Design a protein around this ligand. Structure first.
Ligand SMILES: [Fe+3]
Ligand SMILES: [Fe+3]
Lengths: 136, 168, 392, 515, 131, 392, 74
């Protein structure tokens, strides 16, 4: 969980301590990350989804989820994948809510994103490159 | 003294048990007419069930209405009162009655008693509503003639109240 | 300047926002954030439609389903209650049970009709630019459509006005919304017929979009004699608000109205080269089916199957249906005299074509309404009764 | 022909259809209203705002999209739903849900006007009004729905359609803009709903209140209420057309002045004390004294621009106006005594006036400090706010001879021994039942029309029952089943429970037993 | 103009001076007023109309016009009449703007209101009673 | 307690709002509040459409009308400029002059199409509920509509893709908006044809909504041979972006496309009892007329009458029109072979009926386009050329 | 036939149309890009967000109405 904080790792350091790590030899090439980042812009529907879906069943299934308040948007980072079922959101909101309506306030993605049925997913997987691990 | 709860109490329960024993249209018609004369309007005979009579009246209406559909020919549901009278004859009789009224006090009692005796399900709904509207037209017009003409002291006498208190 | 204080806003004024922040508790004082959480949901979850609509009507416990108590504060002269059980013959254990399956509160209702409003005007500007009116059959355009489709607006208008007493008298909030939205769709139909006539008049020199001839036909032509008699009775002859909604939408408009709009004007437009009228009947037929969903819920799901009064209510619904079905059959028998004025088209305007159109209307009606309230109907008998008015 | 046609792009504008609407009606013997009325004059008038169904929906949907955009996107992202002063957020539980029932009844009243209209154009206009009152019902509901989701106290925002039935102030709301519209003469609604209710009272109730909301941090209510009132222009104009027809016929004009005075008194009797109480006591920041708000909107502007102008055509200044002005000055302070004393029967959390409030009340209503101010300060000393105190002021009123009566006609509470507004107690017995009336205008209505006024009051329903049992039965609790929705303070700590009420031992009397 | 201020006349007074005039015998019946009152809810379109129509050509035609800021709405009072032409507003805003669109943010009226063509008017006139 | 600061909003935080209020000047620093006030208005006053669109393209002064200066920062390998005069044969004194008469920037465009999107689904749900498909001619439905209207989606799809290079190459912002909106309307047409076929498949057992048969017809049936040849050339055979827009919308789609959509499928639907297809052609014909307003402004108002290059541009437009009109006449000559497969209806599908339909298409085209660029055309000669393909 | 039909209410959802989009292309020799590129590999891939023109417009207009409400009103 902690490693998915917005201010994780080097971001805790300031001044010369930050510069020393920022310019360290080993930090001059990218490092593979298993994370995904999802940004949701704040709104009545999104704020209900954060509170009753992402921070409840979402975090129960994926305890590495971090959610941070960034004023106009929610910043979410997690290991592996994040999913939101528009059907679950529509049940919560009491109004028509397809996966297309869910996207109205899904603002950004760092990861491989897609919709399938009523569900939106962002994943660390590299679809079309990563090979399936089960025949099932 | 002490009122029982609003929506579930021994008075409503006891009246529901009486209503369940009604078995014919004639019996339930006399029951509901007697009830409405005894317990509804400012000219009722008794305020003993004041906070329960409207719910009880609903339950009597429901019993009479089901008895009507179980027991009467369809044509009677449209054209007759459950007294056996022709519904259009009832309409004509009471409109004539209120147009013959000589004062607003005569007119108001005719309208009130029409409702006490013929409120659905006694009279078919369509006939009742148009009669009630014709009666109400006459009552409103006679009451709104010189509405401010009688001082309060004289209105209290005409109404026949017993004045219990007048603040100085 | 100005004579009155320029009020400082508590949301943005630093001093007032700080005072407000000091006063607001640091935690919520209850966790129940579902508006009117105690409504019994019809579907798997409570809808916003239900939350905004249900129990807005302040009924007491002596009107079935009411949560309040006591008499009304002010009644009519004589004692008629503000709302009361005397308004209708039908009974139920809860007048609030009705749900429109389209879940229309005011906002989705006007949102959808706004789409139709704006697209209609774009369609007309393009249709006039296209010149597509050039291939319409002129006799259809001038002698049948202009005159008898015009006259049909009076049927829609009368059905609109039948709802005025329903809007005052009916006993719950979801029912009142269903009724008022149905009324606006009927007056919309009448206005849209007139809009089509006014539009044709801009394209066709000599084409007269005055209502004079349509009104004369509605009020005096034998073809509409039975229809006008029925509409007058449903609108002004009764006040039981359930009787109005049932007779109006579930019997008369579902048989006569559907035959005239769909089997005659819409269907025959696509036999006489009329590329304009189907755009307008698309709207009235969409409105009909939306209205039917809500009417069906009120009378079938709620009233005909109410646990205590279902059979009681079916007794009245059966009696009404017998009466207004006879009225509607007589209206259709009058109306099929119009086929004597149209050009013969095999399978459409000959006896077999009209017979199949009547089999669709009465057959669909048996499925959609009659079977659901226990009303026995012989479809072939009704088809033959109407065909007695068809000139061979 | 088949080749030549004008291909200029044309449509059909709303006014082109509207000019044919009057011809949509047709003559038949039964074509007349179903409702009782005194008014039978010719009423073939013309709509001032030409509208057809398609254009109606276009206009209203455009208003909605802007409003719901502001609410669901902008203000939600700002967190505005919890930036409201607690006093004001509590006030909106009452203002919005009580206004909701006024809008709801206005649907039915507008349908009576639709039914009694004789011109197709006016029937068309009243349907648009019927639809607007449905819109306004859902808009009021939406305010409390939004507050339920975003404000720190959703209880009572989330369930007033049942919890309002517990308390005495709700009874008078069912008459003021409700029964008083729909239970009577249908054509007369053009006078009571429209010439009085819409043209006079919706301006302070729906417009002026948005300034008080803004001062107290609430930008939700301005967003909605200011959109609500945009529809009201068409409603006032509908009613004016019929008032003209009434005025032009000597036989119908002879009813107009009595109907106008009865409507004005009926609505002001409740609106004046209750909205003044909600504005001044249910706010932290005050925009201006209520009595000046009333002077501006009611006495000067509606009184002069509508009634004073119609005086040229025989319409009289309401005879009850002098009594009403006295109410505008003191009746909301009288009402505050009853509201605070009976706080457990409500669904809102109240706040006693603080030191700067008290200075403001005394500056603007000299005499307030020595009467109302001393009472509130004594209640505070006795433990008004403290759940462990065992103190509820209704019992204190009775122990000092300050009985509370309910007007049989208006349902407005009256405390004759403390009131400075208009009123005096009349108690009559009629056919075995006692009735309390509180002013000359309502006493006449009841004496002439007793079968119109049989409303049970809270003392009759609750006689001899203990306060906490009534509250529990009426669901006047939060989701824990024990903490009251209503509170005598607006802080987050030390909330009262049913057991705290029960320790006071408050039992309802029969206030008329002494007569 | 000054008589059309929101705080005109008795509204300038406070405390006892207010009460003395509020309860004066001559002020217990209404008094005919030649004014109209128009309320416009604040919005991008309304605020441009206030600044470039009402307060320029409107006030030049009717110098009795008073506009006050009431937080969420504009309060406007004038002798006789106030008019707003949607066609002039549409030219100012650069987007389609019929008289129907103008009404989206016209929140309230004290006076006789109507539209005629592209123009909205509120007037002291009592149409159908006045000649 | 999240790891990062919870940022205080300057609009509502008392301390930051007070700092901002102290920093903001007490008066405005200029009075010119009209965004891009220097755009020359086409109409009486500047429109929001013009303000948001005009000069978004950063052209330098060596592309006519550009307000910037100097070479591009990065060009193609070899030197092709980011945008350049080599992209088209046509010339103008100012590439920014074009104005769509519908004034569509992105928002009004998707607002209108959203209305059509939602209303279409309500119409379909009601039409299936109505059962109105029951009176369509089965042969029309199965052998003509399903197969050959299906095949027409490929023409719309090809015209859609012709715009891809236009979207990259064209020289101003209002032209780019016109082209892209025209392209979406074409792919919408193709999708709506498939939507209608998929919908009929839900109503008619055995009706196959696969594109297999339409695609075989488009790619190999002689009826579409000339049309497919033309579409392939306009889409992939040229890159002059004005030539693509002109040949595509002003020649091919205005003659072949209008004949197939309006004179064949829409018109004959209203001869064979098809109450469904007119709902779909209503949209494509509205889109055609909207697109035509913009295409007309670009080529007639701006290019054929450019003060310096009008006659120059007409030389190219005339040459293009000669070529693509011959292609379109050949496409129509092939296409009218489809009449040999339809049931004869006098005045519609006989020689006189087809001749009058071609007179409408070629006559309207001469007025709408040819006359405005000085292109001589003998309508009767073109009608006779096409009727040589009509089987008597 | 002319009397019997399924009258269940149905429409056509965007993914139902989208399934057929791949088949809208057809083969011809000139059917290749106009622009210079180094990349000539096979690229017959599938969209991850199925959209058609009508649904595109519905989604974006819904975003717009909320945004412009907030700006122009609130
Ligand atoms: Fe309202
Ligand atoms: Fe209203």
């Amino acid at each position: 969980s902690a490693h998915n904080a917005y201010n994780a790792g080097i971001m805790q350091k300031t001044g010369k301590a930050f510069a020393d790590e920022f310019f360290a030899e080993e930090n001059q090439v990218v490092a593979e990350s298993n994370a995904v980042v999802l940004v949701l812009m704040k709104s009545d529907e999104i704020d209900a989804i954060i509170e009753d879906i992402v921070l409840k069943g979402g975090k129960a299934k994926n305890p590495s989820i971090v959610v941070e308040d960034k004023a106009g948007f929610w910043w979410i980072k997690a290991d592996g994948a994040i999913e939101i079922d528009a059907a679950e959101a529509g049940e919560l909101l009491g109004k028509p809510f397809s996966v297309y309506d869910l996207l109205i306030n899904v603002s950004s993605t760092v990861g491989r994103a897609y919709t399938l049925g009523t569900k939106f997913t962002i994943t660390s997987e590299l679809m079309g490159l990563d090979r399936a691990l089960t025949d099932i | 003294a002490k009122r029982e709860p609003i929506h579930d109490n021994s008075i409503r329960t006891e009246w529901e048990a009486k209503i369940a024993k009604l078995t014919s249209v004639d019996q339930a018609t006399k029951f509901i007419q007697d009830f409405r004369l005894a317990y509804t309007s400012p000219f009722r005979k008794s305020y003993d069930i004041d906070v329960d009579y409207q719910y009880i009246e609903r339950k009597i209406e429901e019993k009479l209405s089901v008895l009507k559909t179980e027991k009467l020919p369809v044509a009677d549901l449209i054209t007759k009162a459950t007294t056996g009278e022709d519904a259009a004859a009832v309409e004509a009789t009471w409109i004539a009655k209120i147009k013959a009224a000589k004062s607003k006090y005569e007119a108001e009692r005719i309208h009130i008693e029409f409702r006490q005796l013929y409120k659905p399900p006694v009279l078919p709904v369509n006939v009742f509503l148009r009669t009630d509207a014709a009666l109400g037209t006459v009552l409103m017009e006679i009451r709104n003639t010189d509405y401010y003409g009688t001082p309060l002291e004289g209105l209290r006498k005409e109404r026949g109240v017993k004045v219990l208190h007048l603040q100085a | 300047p100005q004579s009155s204080q320029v009020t400082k806003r508590g949301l943005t004024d630093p001093e007032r926002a700080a005072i407000i922040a000091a006063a607001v508790p640091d935690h919520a004082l209850d966790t129940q954030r579902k508006y009117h959480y105690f409504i019994q949901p019809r579907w798997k979850r409570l809808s916003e439609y239900e939350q905004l609509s249900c129990y807005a009507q302040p009924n007491p416990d002596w009107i079935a389903g009411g949560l309040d108590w006591g008499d009304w504060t002010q009644k009519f002269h004589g004692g008629r209650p503000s709302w009361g059980n005397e308004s209708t013959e039908l009974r139920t254990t809860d007048w609030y049970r009705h749900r429109d399956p389209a879940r229309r509160w005011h906002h989705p209702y006007v949102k959808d009709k706004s789409e139709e409003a704006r697209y209609t005007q774009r369609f007309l500007a393009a249709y006039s630019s296209e010149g597509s009116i050039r291939t319409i059959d002129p006799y259809w355009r001038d002698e049948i459509l202009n005159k008898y489709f015009g006259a049909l607006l009076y049927s829609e208008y009368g059905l609109f006005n039948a709802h005025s007493s329903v809007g005052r008298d009916c006993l719950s909030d979801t029912i009142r919304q269903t009724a008022v939205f149905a009324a606006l769709d009927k007056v919309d139909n009448a206005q849209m017929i007139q809009m089509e006539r006014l539009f044709i008049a801009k394209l066709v020199p000599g084409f007269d979009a005055s209502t004079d001839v349509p009104k004369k036909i509605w009020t005096t032509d034998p073809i509409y004699s039975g229809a006008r008699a029925t509409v007058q009775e449903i609108w002004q002859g009764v006040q039981d608000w359930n009787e109005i909604l049932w007779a109006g939408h579930a019997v008369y408009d579902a048989t006569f109205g559907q035959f005239a709009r769909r089997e005659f004007f819409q269907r025959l437009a696509t036999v006489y080269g009329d590329t304009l009228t189907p755009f307008f009947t698309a709207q009235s037929q969409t409105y009909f089916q939306t209205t039917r969903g809500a009417i069906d819920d009120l009378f079938v799901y709620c009233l005909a199957n109410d646990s205590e009064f279902g059979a009681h209510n079916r007794t009245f619904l059966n009696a009404w249906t017998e009466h207004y079905l006879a009225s509607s059959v007589a209206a259709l028998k009058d109306f099929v005299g119009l086929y004597a004025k149209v050009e013969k088209v095999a399978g459409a305007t000959d006896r077999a074509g009209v017979s199949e159109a009547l089999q669709r209307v009465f057959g669909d009606w048996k499925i959609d309404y009659a079977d659901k309230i226990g009303f026995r109907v012989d479809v072939d008998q009704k088809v033959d009764a109407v065909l007695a008015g068809y000139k061979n | 022909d088949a080749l030549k046609v004008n291909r200029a792009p044309v449509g059909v504008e709303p006014q082109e259809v509207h000019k044919w609407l009057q011809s949509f009606n047709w003559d038949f013997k039964e074509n007349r209203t179903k409702y009782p009325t005194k008014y039978h004059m010719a009423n073939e008038t013309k709509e001032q705002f030409k509208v057809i169904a398609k254009e109606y929906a276009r206009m209203e949907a455009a208003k909605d999209e802007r409003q719901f955009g502001t609410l669901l996107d902008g203000l939600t992202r700002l967190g505005a739903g919890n930036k409201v002063h607690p006093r004001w957020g509590e006030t909106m539980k009452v203002i919005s849900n009580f206004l909701e029932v006024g809008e709801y009844n206005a649907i039915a009243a507008s349908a009576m006007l639709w039914d009694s209209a004789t011109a197709a154009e006016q029937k068309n206009g009243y349907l648009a009004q019927v639809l607007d009152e449905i819109r306004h019902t859902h808009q009021c509901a939406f305010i409390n729905h939004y507050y339920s989701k975003h404000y720190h106290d959703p209880a009572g925002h989330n369930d007033a359609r049942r919890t309002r039935a517990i308390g005495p102030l709700w009874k008078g709301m069912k008459r003021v803009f409700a029964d008083g519209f729909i239970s009577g003469d249908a054509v007369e609604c053009s006078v009571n709903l429209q010439l009085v209710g819409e043209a006079c009272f919706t301006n302070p109730l729906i417009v002026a209140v948005t300034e008080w909301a803004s001062a107290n941090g609430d930008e939700i209510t301005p967003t909605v209420f200011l959109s609500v009132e945009t529809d009201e222009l068409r409603h006032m104009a509908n009613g004016y057309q019929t008032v003209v027809s009434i005025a032009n016929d000597p036989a119908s004009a002879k009813f107009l002045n009595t109907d106008l005075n009865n409507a004005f008194w009926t609505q002001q009797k409740y609106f004046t004390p209750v909205l003044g109480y909600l504005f001044e006591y249910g706010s932290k920041f005050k925009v201006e004294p209520w009595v000046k708000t009333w002077n501006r909107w009611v006495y000067e502007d509606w009184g002069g621009i509508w009634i004073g102008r119609l005086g040229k055509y025989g319409v009289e200044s309401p005879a009850s106006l002098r009594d009403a002005k006295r109410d505008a000055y003191w009746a909301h302070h009288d009402l505050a005594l009853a509201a605070y004393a009976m706080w457990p029967l409500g669904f809102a959390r109240l706040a006693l006036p603080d030191e700067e409030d008290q200075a403001w009340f005394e500056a603007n209503y000299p005499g307030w400090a020595d009467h109302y101010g001393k009472i509130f300060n004594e209640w505070k000393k006795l433990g008004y706010e403290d759940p462990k105190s065992g103190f509820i002021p209704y019992q204190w009123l009775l122990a000092n001879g300050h009985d509370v009566y309910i007007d049989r006609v208006s349902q407005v509470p009256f405390i004759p021994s403390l009131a400075k507004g208009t009123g005096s107690l009349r108690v009559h017995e009629f056919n075995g039942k006692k009735h309390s009336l509180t002013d000359d205008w309502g006493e006449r209505q009841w004496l002439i029309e007793p079968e119109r006024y049989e409303c049970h009051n809270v003392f009759e329903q609750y006689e001899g029952r203990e306060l906490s049992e009534v509250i529990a039965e009426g669901h006047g609790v939060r989701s824990d089943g024990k903490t009251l929705i209503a509170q005598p303070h607006t802080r987050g700590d030390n909330l009262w429970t049913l057991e705290d009420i029960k320790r006071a031992g408050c039992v309802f009397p029969d206030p008329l037993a002494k007569f």
